[PDB]
Nucleic acid binder design. Structure first.
Length: 278
RNA sequence: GGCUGGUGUGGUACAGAGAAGCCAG
């Protein structure tokens, strides 16, 4: 498995020691072992925030400030989704919608920086909405990115090329903790879930959340050219493809986001008949 | 490329999805 072909980190992992020597705010978290290898403790929220923030400044020229109490995005995964939307819309101005943009507003900042895309970035959480606004303003992108606070993560709001969404993966707290594990001596993950309650869970999990978005798309249809959501669980892909089939959506496709050991999935659909399906 | 169950993740990670992969109806 490989990252997206155009992902800048495909076969080029960041050099932690190089970054440590260049960014003092970062080296505090890197350690090099005796045998000569560098590591972060990805279970430390401050370390992962440092890495993501450092990667965004060194490789993309973005200075972001995010809190430890919300999701800390990981750059390679988010880049795999950005590049897939590039394939979807055929990458003249292109506009997108980011449903639940997070405290980092990372999908708009990347899409605007890489491709000049315009974004409507929505958020339901006061903490994330503030940090998203500040991150758009301090990178001088208020022209391209418009952060809004909405009551619900939905498409039904007061011609667009695409929408993006990190849906809440989980349905209850046990899922949000992963105690739904077969064998108790299962190995724990290498990461942390620092996300807020509206970032990481929803009624009926991502299955019902994405169904909500599917039903929103049935009223909008051609107002957006492509609809897309990421999926955190492989088991969500088949029943959602079936919901698209039962509702009579003509164009449907999906992909895998491959980075590290955790792999993510995504689903896209359209009501146009001109658009090419990757 | 399908689907259904045991196996498989102590780390340049990716909200670990019991995932990719492996075996078999």
């Amino acid at each position: 498995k490989s990252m997206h072909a155009r992902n800048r980190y495909k076969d080029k992992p960041p050099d932690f020691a190089y970054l440590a020597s260049k960014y003092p705010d970062f080296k505090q978290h890197v350690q090099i072992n005796l045998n000569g290898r560098v590591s972060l403790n990805f279970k430390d929220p401050e370390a992962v925030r440092a890495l993501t923030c450092t990667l965004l400044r060194e490789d993309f020229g973005l200075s972001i400030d995010i809190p430890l109490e919300r999701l800390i995005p990981t750059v390679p995964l988010r880049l795999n989704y950005i590049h897939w939307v590039e394939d979807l819309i055929g990458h003249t101005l292109r506009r997108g919608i980011d449903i639940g943009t997070g405290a980092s507003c990372i999908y708009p900042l990347l899409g605007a920086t890489l491709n000049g895309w315009y974004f409507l970035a929505t958020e339901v959480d006061d903490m994330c909405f503030n940090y998203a606004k500040k991150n758009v303003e301090q990178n001088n992108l208020s022209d391209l990115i418009k952060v809004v606070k909405v009551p619900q993560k939905t498409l039904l709001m007061d011609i667009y090329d695409f929408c993006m969404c990190n849906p809440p993966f989980f349905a209850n707290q046990l899922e949000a903790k992963g105690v739904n594990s077969r064998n108790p001596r299962r190995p724990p993950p290498s990461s942390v879930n620092t996300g807020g309650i509206t970032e990481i869970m929803a009624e009926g999990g991502e299955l019902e959340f994405v169904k909500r978005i599917i039903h929103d798309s049935l009223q909008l249809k051609k107002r957006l050219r492509w609809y897309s959501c990421m999926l955190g669980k492989k088991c969500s892909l088949a029943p959602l493809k079936e919901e698209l089939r039962i509702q009579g959506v003509p164009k449907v496709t999906y992909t895998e986001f491959c980075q590290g050991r955790t792999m993510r999935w995504a689903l896209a659909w359209s009501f146009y008949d001109d658009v090419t399906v990757p």
